[PDB]
């Protein structure tokens, strides 16, 4: 016969299935923003 999961087992599986690096990306995008804006500023003046 099938060994069907208990309530507690069935719940824990669902929770497991569902439920700093972002700060680093934003930082690198701003540095990219800054460098490009400085480039355009030097070219335009401003």
């Amino acid at each position: 016969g099938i060994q069907r999961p208990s309530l507690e087992e069935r719940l824990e599986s669902i929770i497991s299935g569902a439920a700093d690096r972002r700060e680093r990306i934003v930082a690198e995008c701003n540095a990219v923003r800054q460098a490009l804006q400085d480039l355009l500023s030097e070219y335009m003046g401003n």
């Binding site: 669902i14 990306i25 934003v26 070219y43 335009m44």
Partner: protein, 247 residues
């Protein structure tokens, strides 16, 4: 016209870039030499910064299980790196001839490419953030599925012990997400739908209370009806979480 940037974080990063490029275009068309400085070092600084964005982007995507993120990210890497070569070439051109026409087209096209590419990279990470929220949402949807099998008060204790935390986590993710969006109509939709879900929580438990004690018909229909109404609201949330003007 270029649409409003999706979130405030994205907006704060890219809006000054978009604004300065349109200014460059206007200057390029309406403007009129030896006043042009050497752009070799400035372009080199962009190239360096872009390179760092690509590396960090790879290290970040390296440590995820999101296979979609792994797939959609590399095209953005290519966009910004290609755009850099147009800037390098432009600086070299202007160094030889300050009046170089193709050099100016490269400067504009390369700057636009940096913006578009950085935009793609940010939207791709943003979509991965949304997918995490949706998983939490879908988990609760499936958690509501099992409300039908709770027949004892002890089982109701067990059921409530986990549903509460999950509800709280979801509510927190949606709250943090909504106040980041630049579209008011979407914020109010998310807030309202989440509020409806939260107030239907004690209703569900109370119905399961009287159903459990009764078993050991009216409470049967009331429970299922609550689950239905709660589920519909969460799916609506899922729909609004994915709404964007960038595609």
């Amino acid at each position: 016209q270029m649409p409003v940037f999706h979130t405030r974080t994205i907006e704060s990063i890219l809006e000054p870039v978009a604004q300065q490029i349109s200014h460059l275009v206007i200057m390029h068309e309406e403007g009129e030499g030896k006043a042009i400085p050497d752009l070799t070092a400035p372009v080199s600084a962009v190239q360096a910064a872009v390179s760092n964005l690509v590396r960090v982007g790879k290290e970040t995507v390296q440590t995820t299980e999101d296979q979609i993120l792994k797939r959609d990210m590399p095209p953005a890497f290519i966009k910004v790196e290609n755009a850099c070569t147009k800037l390098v070439r432009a600086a070299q051109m202007l160094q030889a001839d300050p009046y170089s026409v193709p050099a100016r087209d490269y400067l504009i096209d390369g700057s636009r490419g940096i913006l578009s590419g950085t935009s793609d990279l940010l939207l791709t990470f943003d979509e991965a953030e949304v997918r995490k929220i949706i998983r939490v949402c879908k988990g609760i949807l499936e958690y509501l599925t099992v409300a039908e099998v709770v027949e004892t008060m002890e089982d109701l204790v067990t059921y409530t012990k986990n549903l509460g935390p999950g509800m709280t986590k979801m509510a927190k993710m949606i709250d943090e997400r909504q106040q980041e969006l630049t579209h008011q109509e979407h914020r109010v939709m998310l807030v309202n739908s989440m509020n409806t879900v939260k107030e239907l929580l004690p209703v569900l438990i109370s119905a399961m209370k009287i159903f459990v004690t009764t078993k050991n018909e009216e409470a049967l229909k009331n429970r299922n009806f609550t689950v239905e109404k709660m589920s519909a609201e969460i799916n609506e949330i899922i729909r609004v979480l994915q709404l964007t003007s960038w595609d």
